[PDB]
Amino acid sequence: YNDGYDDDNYDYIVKNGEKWMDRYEIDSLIGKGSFGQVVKAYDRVEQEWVAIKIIKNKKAFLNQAQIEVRLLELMNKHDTEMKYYIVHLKRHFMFRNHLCLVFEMLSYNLYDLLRNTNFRGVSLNLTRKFAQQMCTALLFLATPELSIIHCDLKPENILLCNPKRSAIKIVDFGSSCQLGQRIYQYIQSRFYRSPEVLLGMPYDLAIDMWSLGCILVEMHTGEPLFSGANEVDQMNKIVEVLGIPPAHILDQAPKARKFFEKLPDGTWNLKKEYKPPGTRKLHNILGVETGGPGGRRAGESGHTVADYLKFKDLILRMLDYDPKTRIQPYYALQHSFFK
Numbered sequence: 001y002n003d004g005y006d007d008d009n010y011d012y013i014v015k016n017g018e019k020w021m022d023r024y025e026i027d028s029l030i031g032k033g034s035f036g037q038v039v040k041a042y043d044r045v046e047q048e049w050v051a052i053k054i055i056k057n058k059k060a061f062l063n064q065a066q067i068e069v070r071l072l073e074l075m076n077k078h079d080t081e082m083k084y085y086i087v088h089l090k091r092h093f094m095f096r097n098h099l100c101l102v103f104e105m106l107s108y109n110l111y112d113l114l115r116n117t118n119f120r121g122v123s124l125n126l127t128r129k130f131a132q133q134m135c136t137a138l139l140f141l142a143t144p145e146l147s148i149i150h151c152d153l154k155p156e157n158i159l160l161c162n163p164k165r166s167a168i169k170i171v172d173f174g175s176s177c178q179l180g181q182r183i184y185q186y187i188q189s190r191f192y193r194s195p196e197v198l199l200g201m202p203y204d205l206a207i208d209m210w211s212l213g214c215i216l217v218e219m220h221t222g223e224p225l226f227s228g229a230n231e232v233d234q235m236n237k238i239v240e241v242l243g244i245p246p247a248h249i250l251d252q253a254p255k256a257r258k259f260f261e262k263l264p265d266g267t268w269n270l271k272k273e274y275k276p277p278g279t280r281k282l283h284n285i286l287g288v289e290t291g292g293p294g295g296r297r298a299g300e301s302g303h304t305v306a307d308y309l310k311f312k313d314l315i316l317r318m319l320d321y322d323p324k325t326r327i328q329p330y331y332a333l334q335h336s337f338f339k
């Protein structure tokens, strides 16, 4: 293990108080993920805490992180005032056989926020703040010179900047790509995976908007909207809410028959118990008329029927099966939900 320094998962074994390169004092592990670890460090030179993503000493992670660095640096050539809600990569270096990405220090991810609500959700008002930021972030990523598809939006990859404000940033561009790259497939985290990707179809930046629609519902209900145990269960759970996808899409989907078959009348239906297609209404998931998710927002300011109907509309537009008509970031931002 790399001159001593690695565990059996090819992680750097953090030693609290270690100094690196006469510059960073490692304080502690913040958290682990697939890619490796994020540690809290003090940068003596800039005099600030930084979150150092220490990539596993494994080629696949190293290579993914090099793609991440490239995309972050590209995003940086634009967002120098850090306006657009993407985590700032300060610098990167190889250290003891681990690629290290030095980020600004942020705070809890939105999953952990949901965990602190006991998976019962945050307010629609907070949901709206997250939504507005996330739509602005997507707006940014879709700037032509970037055209970046995050490809793994989920609550864990959206972080509070700090524990007392509603400001957030997107993290983790390990799985990201630019438009026209199509080599990736079975991409996105399953709960947040777009129909086009489930269907093995060409995809674009609209996949991120699908993920966001899923995320926003979850932020408010506390629970994943579409919590499939596998792709088939995923598509089924999607269909429960949204109905059979448009025929014009299914006729074009290489993986149509993973999920669907044509009936003798030439129409598409599921292969296989679930609520029948389109019968699990978002109207009811959100509790539009019944005091919000599980009735728990009954009375609360900012949780009116009118508010929920606006939120539902926005969400349904994000969860358009058709990536061509799925609401784009700009128009999402103009939605009545945000007035």
Ligand SMILES: Cc1nc2ccc(-c3ccnc(N)c3)nc2n1-c1ccc(N2CCN(C)CC2)c(F)c1
Binding pocket: 030, 031, 032, 033, 037, 038, 051, 053, 087, 103, 104, 105, 106, 107, 108, 109, 112, 159, 171, 172, 173
């Ligand atoms: C607190 C904190 N600030 C961070 C800044 C950047 C990143 C990051 C992580 C991954 N990819 C990129 N591009 C940036 N992470 C930051 N974190 C942070 C927050 C929470 C966790 N976890 C991970 C999972 N665990 C179960 C809960 C806490 C973390 F590792 C880092």
